[PDB]
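Operator note (shift B, R.M.): manual run for P55 BLK protein tyrosine kinase requested after the automated queue skipped it. Running by hand, logging everything below so the morning shift can see what happened. Input copied straight from the record, untouched. If output looks odd, do not overwrite the archive copy; leave it for review.
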Amino acid sequence: GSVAPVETLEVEKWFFRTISRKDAERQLLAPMNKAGSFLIRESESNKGAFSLSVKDITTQGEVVKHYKIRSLDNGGYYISPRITFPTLQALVQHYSKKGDGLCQKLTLPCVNLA
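Run finished. Output pasted below as returned.
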């Protein structure tokens, strides 16, 4: 059949850029999603580094989360030095079914609005 322009996998919600901290948080805090819906915003001063927001549905009152993903040349990305992955997507694969210490395993990358 026809060739589609740019064979897409995701590149929406989970894989985001350097949106403001409160912006990425605005999309998770929405009642449209829940704990596991994430944002992986970039560090705008990054050495290939990212960051990550998660909807923490705690007893305090629906707060996001914040993590520090450093991009390794020899290990892709790491948040906890114990858990490293060759790329964020391998990080977002494992976390989907088992957050593994993130206290919030992924579910659905926010609410696609485009």
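Quick read of the result: The longest helix spans residues 88-97. Strands lie at 38-39, 50-54, 67-72, 76-80, 83-85.
Leaving this for review. - R.M.
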